[PDB]
Design a protein around this ligand. Structure first.
Ligand code: GNP
Ligand code: MG
Lengths: 297, 608, 103, 49, 176
């Protein structure tokens, strides 16, 4: 992130339009695609985007997935291990109770039945003090584990956020005093441009992003957006989403610069679903400003 | 005694009374509709002869000659009195309410009050609402098909046991036999009231036509878009007619249709009223008297106007309006819902990103909620009724409700920032502007002055330090005082005429809205996005939930339905306490069922 | 290509959408009654998991047939892995669910 | 201790499916009363007649 | 209350620069060609508050098909030509004016000269002379405007903002 990726985003931000305004619905879905191709024609012609920047994003995205999956497996193995230690820790299940008897009597009888299995008092009543200490320490280590209210994915996300400190990620303060709308000085703007370029249907002799990088690239981009607090802006401001909305409203198909319009929007919808799912997962794992009123002159 | 009329207090009290009476009549009609909850004295076959005898002559009472046709009722008079007291007294209260409104309307006519929605919004709104409440109450009464049996049977038992009929019975019987087609008699009764009512209706020409625009105009003017102009989003949205921005369009249609039906004389002369009348007819094909009760407009209007001498043109106009409504109303509302879905989604996301914008752009939130509520109500009442044929079924209402709930949650959570923004607004801007306005008046009395001076002083005292301390305000005094001031200045032979000071009325209305937002956030939310009607449309409520679950795309917004169940307690009135437990129990059941079904669907996907 | 949709992704998309709706509200109040939707899912998962485990043993008394333990263990592990994936969406704790059902 | 450096607590808790208040909402009996116009006088600059 | 204005003309004639000078009060020396854009300003003219929506077309030949989208449901038409470019002046006679006539025949037209600041520049008069071109003068526009039958003829300079406000105020007056 601090190296090759930072350089690529810096170079790419300089070839992005200074001001981009989402066209009005009057222009129509066919005309709005022509506006975006002209506005972002530098990014499309760029070649190393699909060779280096995509590769690096896949590396980080795959790493995060590995961290998530390994944590899940560790918990699954950990809970299975704890299940086998229940008899020796006086951990009993909820036994069936029917009319005629109360829970307290049945539980007390069941506990007495399994009393010999319990280890600590058996060593305490008879056994060397060294055995007592070792058994107590072993019992403490076994009972306390990392699936009993402990996680580490949050810490990983926080550390990644700390690694992002260059102002280029967030950009300068907005002139309106609230948020950037038309300016393209934020990373989510570039991710939208990236979404546009790799949502174009490729030819038969070339591979697609999924065939090459899979979901790792999307995971990396969504994580960067989330850690910078720009997920809502990305959803509101997105060239592909705007094109999809207009296409649905009007419903027109036409080949623009050898880029079919229909197949493009379904691809946009599919990636929109994937991005939403990833953002929701990241937000779940991640768990003001007051303006002044006008004053009379 | 113009100052002692107290129109403000009378209007606000009677409006609440009318709502309570409407609730009582609706419960009575519902109870007697099914043969399971109606009184046991009307279902027994042995007592059928007495009922027929009383029905044959309801107002006339004859007891000294049984004629062998009534001996059965003699032996159970005591239980009759004990069990039918509730219904008899409820009708009595309706008669008292009817008398009070008639007296108030006559007082308004003699005083020659000035009505204008833009100038005096509160007075005109209360006046029109009261009239519609009175008209709806009579129409609902004319539907309960047993009012005669109850009144006749109860009084007859009272006469037998005591020898004298009820003191207030004859008036009730005379009105019942007089109101068989209530609109027909109301038209004749409202002739003296035509001038005031017509002026108020015509005052809506500046609001109603611009609030009934199609989705194309909304898209052209970028309605409810904070992002469309980025350099002015920090600026506070405001307008001179602030209260009318978030008014219920359904209320306007009810006011227009009922008002011109009673004031049909002015339709031939004036053209603005006729065009406004035409637009209301085209906008809808059925109107909602109370909860599920519905009134068709073209058949009823045609029947009333056919007897008139030379109203053939009006009969024709109703025909074309009916044809246009049935042909285009559904498409127009479908497009409106489509645009609103995106608009609410954009507004909610932007507000979440920048919660501080709620204060300046609070009006946009309330306007969006009102529009969404109007569309939901319109779809819900038309879909069940009006079978013409599919076109009245929407599978994306879940998104609209969910974003309405999201806006409600944002207002609840981010209330303090709105309070701080508007308390500063009142203390800094409104107070100074109001003071220089009042001081630039030719002359004012003591009664009018003591109110204006009190408004300025209350606004100056307000400080931001009282907000973070948890202090709770109470601006009901200012609202009532302004309402009283409107009544005082709206009458004739008044020193300070409100007509010549229209800008003052607009300024006060904006200030009142600011106070309403500061202190009555909950009241504004409920009166803007009320959706308690779903409690009385359970079939559609369940069907929509089932469709939402079936479609994976909308499954994200299935939590809106249980959230809507929380609003079911907002339709209860202190006057009808019996209904509260039944509506409260229904809310708990639906919520549990929805959660269970959602869990069932989840585990089914888990298994697959 | 992404245009082709299988059964797994379709179910995955639907489940994620439903889970988001459930987790949108932590709690709600109706007539002074607090409702916790995630508890509904947790209870249903416990019942379904227990029912499925007893069902995949495939025990027919008439033919004296039972599933081999290795196959049952593999199926149980797959079920647990899926349930953990659900935990990535909703805030519910799953380790407890495993403890109760298995014990 | 090494895996613990990168570990944080979980904000997970258990609550019952349905929770009810200590005191329920008992029904209130209805009492018929006439219309009174002298109830809003005590709020604001009212007029007594 | 709301007036729709669309500005058309040859490329590099200062159309977007004029609208930007009117709305943000700033000047940009760069040349970024525009397929389409929308600019909105609120103004008080003749004692009636008017909200002005302004539409920017392209002066490039390739974007001809995507230009007619802006024309429908309009109130006023703006034609801008550079005072230091005779080519744009003649285009009004044979291209930009005939086009607004076809799509919207009964709509008024306001003709605006641009780059007045550069008009008096001998430095600019000289390089145009090496091309054997001479700058346009005031009376020439009067004849052309009368010929195209436009409501009025004016001149502007975004850099000096000498005639910027009059062009829009006069445009609101033509629609009324
Ligand atoms: N000196 C000077 N330069 C100007 C003036 N107005 C515009 N320019 C310059 O002339 C060039 C073209 O202006 P521009 O507004 O981009 O032209 P346009 O016709 O709006 N562009 P398009 O072809 O896309 O429609 C720019 O380099 C701009 O800076 C002016 O008043 N003075
Ligand atoms: Mg331009």
């Amino acid at each position: 992130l601090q190296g090759t990726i930072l350089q690529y985003v810096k170079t790419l931000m300089e070839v992005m339009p200074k001001i981009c305004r989402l066209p009005r619905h009057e222009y129509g879905s066919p005309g709005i695609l022509e506006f975006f191709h002209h506005q972002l024609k530098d990014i499309v012609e760029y070649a190393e985007l699909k060779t280096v920047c995509f590769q690096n994003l896949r590396e980080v995205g795959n790493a995060i997935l590995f961290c998530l999956l390994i944590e899940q497996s560790l918990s699954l193995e950990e809970v299975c291990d704890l299940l086998h230690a229940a008899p020796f820790q006086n951990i009993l299940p909820r036994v069936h109770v029917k009319e005629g008897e109360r829970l307290d009597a049945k539980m007390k009888r069941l506990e007495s039945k399994y009393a010999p299995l319990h280890l600590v008092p058996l060593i305490e009543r008879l056994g060397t003090p060294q055995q007592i200490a070792i058994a107590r320490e072993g019992d403490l280590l076994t009972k306390e584990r990392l699936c009993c209210g402990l996680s580490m994915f949050e810490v990983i996300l926080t550390r990644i956020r700390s690694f992002l400190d260059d102002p280029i990620w967030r950009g300068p303060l907005p002139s309106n005093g609230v948020m950037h709308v038309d300016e393209c000085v934020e990373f989510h703007r570039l991710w939208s441009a990236m979404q546009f370029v790799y949502c174009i249907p490729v030819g038969t002799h070339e591979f697609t992003v999924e065939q090459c990088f899979g979901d790792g690239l999307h995971w990396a981009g969504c994580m960067i957006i989330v850690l910078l607090g720009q997920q809502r802006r990305f959803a509101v401001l997105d060239f592909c989403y705007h094109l999809l909305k207009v296409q649905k409203h009007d419903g027109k198909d036409e080949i623009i610069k050898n880029v079919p319009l229909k197949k493009m929007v379904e691809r946009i919808r599919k990636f929109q679903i994937l991005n939403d799912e990833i953002i929701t997962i990241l937000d779940k794992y991640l768990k003001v400003r007051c303006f002044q009123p006008p004053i009379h002159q | 005694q113009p100052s002692q009329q107290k129109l403000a207090e009378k209007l606000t009290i009677l409006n609440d009374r009318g709502v309570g009476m409407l609730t009582r009549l609706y419960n009575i009609k519902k109870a007697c509709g099914d043969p399971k909850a109606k009184p046991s004295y009307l279902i027994d076959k042995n007592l059928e002869s007495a009922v027929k005898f009383i029905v044959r002559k309801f107002p006339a009472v004859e007891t000294r000659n049984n004629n062998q046709q009534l001996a059965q009722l003699q032996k159970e008079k005591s239980e009759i009195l004990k069990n039918l007291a509730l219904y008899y007294f409820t009708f009595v209260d309706v008669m008292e309410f009817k008398d009070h409104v008639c007296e108030l309307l006559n007082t308004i006519d003699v005083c020659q009050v000035f009505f204008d929605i833009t100038v005096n919004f509160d007075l005109t709104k209360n006046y029109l609402d009261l009239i519609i409440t009175y008209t709806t109450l009579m129409i609902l009464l004319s539907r309960i098909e047993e009012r005669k049996a109850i009144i006749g049977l109860y009084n007859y038992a009272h006469e037998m046991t005591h020898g004298a009929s009820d003191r207030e019975y004859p008036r009730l019987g005379q009105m019942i036999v007089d109101y068989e087609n209530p609109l027909k008699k109301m038209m004749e009764e409202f002739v003296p009231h035509s001038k005031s009512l017509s002026d108020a209706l015509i005052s809506l020409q500046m609001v109603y036509p611009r609030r009934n625009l199609s989705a194309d105009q909304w898209r052209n003017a970028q309605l409810l878009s904070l992002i469309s102009a980025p350099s002015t989003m920090l600026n506070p949205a405001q307008s001179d007619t602030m209260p009318c921005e978030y008014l219920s369009l359904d209320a306007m249609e009810k006011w227009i249709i009922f008002g011109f039906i009673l004031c049909h004389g002015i339709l031939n002369t004036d053209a603005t009223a006729l065009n406004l009348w035409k637009l209301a007819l085209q906008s809808s094909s059925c109107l909602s008297l109370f909860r599920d009760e519905v009134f068709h407009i073209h058949k009823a209007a045609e029947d009333l106007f056919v007897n008139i001498r030379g109203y053939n043109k009006r009969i024709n106009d109703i025909r074309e309006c009916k044809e246009a409504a049935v042909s285009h109303a559904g498409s127009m509302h479908r497009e409106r819902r489509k645009f609103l879905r995106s608009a609410l989604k954009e507004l909610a996301t932007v507000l979440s990103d920048q919660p501080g914008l709620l204060g300046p752009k609070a009006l946009f939130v309330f306007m969006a909620l009102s529009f969404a509520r109007d569309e939901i109500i319109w779809l819900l009442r038309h879909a069940d009724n009006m079978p013409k044929k599919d076109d009245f079924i929407d599978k994306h209402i879940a998104e609209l409700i969910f974003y309405m709930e999201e806006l409600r949650a944002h207002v609840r959570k981010y209330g303090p920032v709105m309070q701080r923004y508007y308390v500063q607004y009142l203390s800094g801007f409104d107070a100074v502007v109001l003071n220089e306005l009042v001081q630039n008046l030719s002359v004012c009395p003591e009664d009018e002055s003591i109110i204006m001076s009190s408004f300025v002083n209350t606004m100056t005292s307000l400080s931001v330090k009282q907000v973070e301390d948890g202090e709770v305000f109470d601006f009901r005094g200012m609202r009532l005082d302004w309402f009283r001031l409107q009544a005082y200045t709206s009458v004739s032979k008044a020193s300070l005429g409100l007509a010549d000071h229209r800008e003052l009325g607009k300024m006060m209305n904006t200030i009142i809205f600011h106070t309403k937002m500061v202190d009555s956030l909950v009241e504004m939310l409920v009166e803007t996005s009320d959706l308690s009607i779903f409690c009385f449309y359970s079939r559609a409520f369940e069907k929509m939930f089932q469709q939402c679950l079936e479609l994976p795309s909308q499954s994200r917004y299935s939590i809106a339905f249980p959230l809507l169940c929380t609003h079911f307690m907002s339709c209860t009135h202190e006057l009808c306490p019996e209904e509260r437990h039944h509506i409260g129990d229904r809310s708990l059941s639906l919520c549990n069922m929805f959660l269970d079904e959602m869990a069932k669907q989840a585990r089914n996907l888990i298994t697959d | 290509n992404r245009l082709v949709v299988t059964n797994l992704d379709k179910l995955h998309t639907a489940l994620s959408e439903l889970c988001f709706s459930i987790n949108y509200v932590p709690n709600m109040v109706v007539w002074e009654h607090t409702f916790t939707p995630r508890e509904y899912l947790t209870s249903h998962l416990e019942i379904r998991f227990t029912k499925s485990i007893v069902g995949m043993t495939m025990y027919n008394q008439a033919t004296q047939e039972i599933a081999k333990p290795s196959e049952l263990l593999t199926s149980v592990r797959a079920y647990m892995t899926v349930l953990q994936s659900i935990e990535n969406y909703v805030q519910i704790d799953i380790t407890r669910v495993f403890n109760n059902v298995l014990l | 201790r090494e895996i613990g450096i990168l570990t944080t607590n979980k904000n997970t808790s258990r609550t019952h499916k349905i929770i009810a208040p200590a005191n329920l909402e008992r029904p209130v009996r209805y009492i018929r009363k006439p219309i009174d116009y002298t109830i809003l006088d005590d709020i604001g600059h009212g007029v007594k007649v | 209350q709301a007036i729709k204005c669309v500005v058309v003309g040859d490329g590099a004639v200062g159309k977007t620069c004029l609208l930007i000078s009117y709305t943000t009060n700033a000047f940009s020396g760069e040349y970024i060609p525009t397929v389409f854009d929308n600019y909105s300003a609120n103004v008080m003219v003749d004692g009636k508050p008017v909200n002005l929506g302004l539409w920017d077309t392209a002066g490039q030949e390739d974007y001809d098909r995507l230009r007619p989208l802006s024309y429908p449901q309009t109130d006023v038409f703006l034609i801008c030509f550079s005072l230091v470019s005779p080519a744009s002046f003649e285009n009004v006679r044979a291209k930009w004016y005939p086009e607004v006539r076809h799509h919207c025949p009964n709509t008024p037209i306001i003709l605006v000269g641009t780059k007045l600041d550069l008009r008096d520049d001998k430095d600019t008069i000289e390089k145009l002379k090496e091309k054997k071109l001479t700058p346009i003068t005031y009376p020439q526009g009067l004849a052309m405007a009368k010929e195209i039958g436009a409501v009025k003829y004016l001149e502007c300079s975004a850099l000096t903002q000498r005639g910027l406000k009059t062009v829009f105020d006069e445009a609101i007056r033509a629609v009324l």
